[PDB]
Amino acid sequence: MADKRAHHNALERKRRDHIKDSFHSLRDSVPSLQGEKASRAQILDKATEYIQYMRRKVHTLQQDIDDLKRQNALLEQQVRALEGSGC
Amino acid sequence: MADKRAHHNALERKRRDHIKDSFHSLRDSVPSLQGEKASRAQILDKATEYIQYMRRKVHTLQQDIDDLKRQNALLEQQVRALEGSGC
């Protein structure tokens, strides 16, 4: 059925290297990570800064969008509710 | 100077577990990761989806902010450049 033992003719190794696998996927997550080889967790160093800072940006970001959304919303509602004799 | 060898009375282990260390930091990156224990790389599974999807949101996000920014910008420039006799 199989020469060596390890597993049963199925994927070798086990859940001890699954990281490196996903890591590779992460390796591409940060395209600059290549010039910043920070140890095997090099993607983790940036992965942790991203989810954190990246998330912070979204909050503050959408924050200016929700405010701007209301502006042009009521802003255009006046630019259109005024033109056509109104003064 | 030191009983066992391993290192020189300094931090034990070496650069073979530095991940788990940063990992712990990542463990908090995803607060829901706890209910989604996806193997040691469990934070990587989400860390990779975040940097990717999270980044995608920013692009599309700021996209609606740059457009909304120009709106209320020219929108208010008319709401103010019209009031005061203009019809």
Swiss-Prot record, chains A, B:
Changing I51S: In PCC; does not repress MYC transcriptional activity. Residues 61-82 are annotated as: Leucine-zipper. Disulfide bonds: none annotated. It is found in: Nucleus; Cell projection, Dendrite. Its main location: nucleus. Keywords: Acetylation, Activator, Cell projection, Disease variant, DNA-binding, Nucleus, Phosphoprotein, Repressor, Transcription, Transcription regulation. One of its GO terms (molecular function) is identical protein binding. High levels found in the brain, heart and lung while lower levels are seen in the liver, kidney and skeletal muscle. Transcription regulator. Forms a sequence-specific DNA-binding protein complex with MYC or MAD which recognizes the core sequence 5'-CAC[GA]TG-3'. The MYC:MAX complex is a transcriptional activator, whereas the MAD:MAX complex is a repressor. May repress transcription via the recruitment of a chromatin remodeling complex containing H3 'Lys-9' histone methyltransferase activity. Represses MYC transcriptional activity from E-box elements. This is Protein max. It comes from Homo sapiens.
